[PDB]
Design a protein around this nucleic acid. Structure first.
Ligand code: NA
Ligand code: NA
Length: 327
DNA sequence: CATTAGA
DNA sequence: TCTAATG
């Protein structure tokens, strides 16, 4: 967590690079397990050799560890960090819709900058187009203060269209977070569950509601169960307009809410942790359900959920307010 | 790890 | 269809 710091982040740096600027999936996967094991090890690594005794730790990474150890740096590390093309990729990546594949491609084309991308907005897809547009607002954080106003409106139309709807705004927001990066709206309806062959419109209805009122202003992607977009809060009585906010709405079989609700609500740890527990308590938790364990090794049969509480009762735990779902 | 675009 | 990008 810190004794092994340098080695981990160094490694990861090493790792992320292969993955993005190169197409080195393996080398990259290589750096990660190492980066991983070396992280678990309870003692200060005092040398490659030392490390090397590890699993996944080979001649190649060891060598790097000594170098880092000996001298507070690494050339390869210093060279990349310098590398303009390379630099390039990492940057272009921030553009929503841009991924490594494109990053490279764009580079090879000579599109290295923000401006570059503009000059050639043609070369760009609508996702990337949007992305391009709201670059600044995309990177900007979302004050709960806003989370609050946003969540309000959303609930409002949800209700307005049909009063049978259930929306929950999951993530850190839900978990008290002073600030979030994008709002995640979990959505379900009685009239939709496991078997009940959809009702795409269920989704559709709302998206369109939201737009009709100017809350949604862009469509990054709309599918019959997962809408992905951009939003904005009515720039008041002038002098102050609201920045472009990434937003996601998703449909869900009312018979799978709470799990999904639980789950998206995190934190990543709280989850893993409760989850770990449900294992002992003879259960199985996953983003959609909760199945009882059968000694044979495994088992199925989804227990019925009506609230976050049911899942709790099931594994006989303490109802944790989302506030303190931190871990 | 599943969903959407797109070509 | 596959392949990329998001989460
Ligand atoms: Na080894
Ligand atoms: Na990106």
């Amino acid at each position: 967590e810190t004794l092994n710091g340098g080695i981990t982040d160094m490694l990861t740096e090493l790792a992320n690079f292969e993955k993005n600027v190169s197409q080195a999936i393996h080398k990259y996967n290589a750096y990660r397990k190492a980066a991983s094991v070396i992280a678990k090890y309870p003692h200060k690594i005092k040398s490659g050799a030392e490390a090397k005794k590890l699993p996944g730790v080979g001649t190649k990474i060891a060598e790097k560890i000594d170098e880092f150890l000996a001298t507070g740096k690494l050339r390869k590390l210093e060279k990349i960090r310098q590398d303009d093309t390379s630099s390039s990729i990492n940057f272009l990546t921030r553009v929503s819709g841009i991924g490594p594949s494109a990053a490279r491609k764009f580079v090879d084309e000579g599109i290295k900058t923000l401006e570059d991308l503009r000059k050639n907005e043609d070369k760009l897809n609508h996702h990337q187009r949007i992305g391009l547009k709201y670059f600044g607002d995309f990177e900007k954080r979302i004050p709960r203060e806003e989370m609050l106003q946003m969540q309000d409106i959303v609930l409002n139309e949800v209700k307005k269209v049909d009063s049978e709807y259930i929306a929950t705004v999951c993530g850190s927001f839900r978990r008290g977070a002073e600030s979030s990066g994008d709002m995640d709206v979990l959505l379900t309806h009685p009239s939709f569950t496991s078997e009940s062959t959809k009702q795409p419109k269920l989704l559709h209805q709302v998206v369109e509601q939201l737009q009709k009122v100017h809350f949604i202003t862009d469509t990054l992607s709309k599918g019959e169960t997962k809408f992905m977009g951009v939003c904005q809060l009515p720039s008041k009585n002038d002098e102050k307009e609201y920045p472009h906010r990434r937003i996601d709405i998703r449909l869900i079989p009312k018979d799978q809410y709470y799990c999904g609700v639980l789950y998206f609500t995190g934190s990543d740890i709280f989850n893993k942790n409760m989850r770990a527990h449900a294992l002992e308590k003879g259960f199985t938790i996953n983003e959609y359900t909760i199945r009882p364990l059968g000694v044979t090794g495994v088992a199925g049969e989804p227990l019925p959920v009506d609230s976050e509480k049911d899942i709790f009762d099931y594994i006989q735990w303490k109802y944790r307010e989302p506030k303190d779902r931190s871990e």
